[PDB]
């Protein structure tokens, strides 16, 4: 068994974490438990604290606007590791006991119970090179020696570890996505009717997505082209919540449906990161530092949860759009669009132990 360790720049205190990815179950999050090793001789009267912080960044690392930082702290939890506060009665995890046994008596535990309804680690890809700092939600564990909490804390006497709050695909599959639409343009005759569906609801990253499309063009109006697209929606909720849109994958077939006819087909679209490196602000899964990440996983939420979850909420839909070519007495080059939306879940399977 291995543990992750980091040390202060002066090397006095060092933080040990059993792992750096913490699974966020909908009901509760796995607690962040760890150990801090100090030396009471260095701390004449100082106290070492550990804080867990959920930081969301609005934009680029630069101030560049009036000298202010576009960085909110959505969640900050703090604990006084040393001296061991007699006030609390928190028990000791098995890994914490093993670390305290391994290290000396100068090893003191810390534990953080992350509350539910908090965002996971997502990073907004900025497309081309503009800044060296990523944009999105992150979780940070910060150990520091200080006389009191309200104090500017020295950078050589503090360790910071980036940890991960992750979610995995639900154990049980959900209902098969499906969508319907019945549309008539000038109400001449029986209308155009589009029906789309997916093969399943939960897909894994890299796995192809099959869209079964069925069109009954009962009117006299020809449809020329059919676009299937996989689109990522990033609800970046903040003060005055917004929503982001990005077409992640696309297949634009030139299949035509004659008037008063029928057309059934299956389109296979695979979303991958190779062709989405030029799209600024794309929700990526948010690794620890610059590393190999992928398109952000769908954020799972409770059925009766607070709709105003701060941070980035990721969703995925498949838009099936029939472009019906328009023209009557005067033949214009404009055309109408009949579209359906199929929501789906794009997640990582739970690791097998």
């Amino acid at each position, epitope marked *: 068994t*291995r543990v992750f360790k980091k040390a202060s720049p002066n090397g006095k205190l060092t933080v040990y974490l059993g792992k750096r990815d913490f699974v966020d179950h909908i009901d509760l999050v796995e607690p962040v438990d760890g150990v801090v090793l100090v030396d009471p001789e260095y701390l004449k009267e100082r106290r070492v604290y550990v804080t867990l912080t959920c930081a969301f960044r609005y934009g680029r690392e630069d101030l560049d606007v009036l000298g202010l930082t576009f960085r909110k702290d959505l969640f900050v939890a703090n604990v006084q590791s040393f001296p061991p506060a007699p006030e609390d009665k928190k028990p000791l995890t098995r890994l914490q006991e093993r670390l305290i046994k391994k290290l000396g008596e100068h090893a003191y535990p810390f534990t953080f119970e992350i509350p539910p309804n908090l965002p996971c680690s997502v990073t907004l890809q900025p497309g081309p090179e503009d800044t060296g700092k990523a944009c999105g939600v992150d979780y940070e564990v910060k150990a520091f020696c200080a006389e009191n909490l309200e104090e500017k804390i020295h950078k050589r006497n503090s360790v910071r570890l980036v940890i991960e709050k992750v979610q995995y695909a639900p154990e049980r599959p959900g209902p098969q996505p499906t969508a319907e639409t019945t549309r008539q343009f000038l109400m001449s005759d029986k209308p155009l009717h589009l029906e789309a569906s997916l093969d399943k609801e939960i897909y*894994y990253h890299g796995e192809p997505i099959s869209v079964n499309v069925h069109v009954t063009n009962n009117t006299n109006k020809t449809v020329k082209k059919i676009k299937i697209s996989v689109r990522q929606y990033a609800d970046i909720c903040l003060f005055n919540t917004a929503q982001y849109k990005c077409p992640v994958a696309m297949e634009e077939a030139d299949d035509t449906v004659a008037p008063s006819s029928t057309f059934c087909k299956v389109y296979t679209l*695979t979303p*991958f*990161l*190779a062709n989405n490196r030029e799209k600024r602000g794309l929700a990526l899964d948010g690794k620890l530092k610059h590393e190999d990440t*992928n398109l952000a996983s769908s954020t799972l939420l409770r059925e009766g949860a607070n709709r105003e979850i701060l941070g980035i909420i990721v969703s995925y839909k498949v838009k099936v759009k029939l472009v019906v070519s328009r023209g009557g007495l005067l033949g214009d080059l404009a055309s109408s669009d009949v579209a359906v939306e199929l929501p789906f879940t794009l997640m990582h399977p739970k*690791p097998k132990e």
Partner: antibody
Amino acid sequence: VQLVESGGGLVQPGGSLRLSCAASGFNVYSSSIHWVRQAPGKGLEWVASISSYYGYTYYADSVKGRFTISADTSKNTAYLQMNSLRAEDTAVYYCARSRQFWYSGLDYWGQGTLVTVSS
Amino acid sequence: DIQMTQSPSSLSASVGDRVTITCRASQSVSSAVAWYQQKPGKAPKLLIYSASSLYSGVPSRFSGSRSGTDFTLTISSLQPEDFATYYCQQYKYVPVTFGQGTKVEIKR
């Protein structure tokens, strides 16, 4: 669930080949494809690797510039073009697959094709 | 570039004996070490990954272990079908390097 290699045979030094690895049961975007060669009476030596999810492509320092690995994602096939074949390229070439997300070793391997560069 | 050294280069054991193969890494690969088994004329088969995790379907007699940069594959009760060449790959860094191989042979 299967990898099938083809395209190996007798060559002359300075010639070229094109090995194809057809992957059945695998998605080129949820898995990375590697080419690993074993010299006659020697150990395994990794040659090339392609990751279609990222478009990443890696080669060993002994084959850079000469060997190029590509993939036809529609057919789920991986190709290795070998140019300027030196006499030290005689080997058996296996196409192996690994998980794209959390690589956990080369789970699946093909039967391997013999490449002989004797003059 | 990491050189992985396997010991012994070849060993002769008998059915039921406990076989141990050692693999030393030049640099420090954290746990990205896999153990593979190749029989003559056949493609290699993954036996263990992450230096401890048994691959699906591999018999439980095979076990991996790590101590620092020193990894070990142990077969508890050697069987006649468990006599082949064993390789030690490290997939922490590019390129991925394999060991020279240990050929387990029968004892007479």
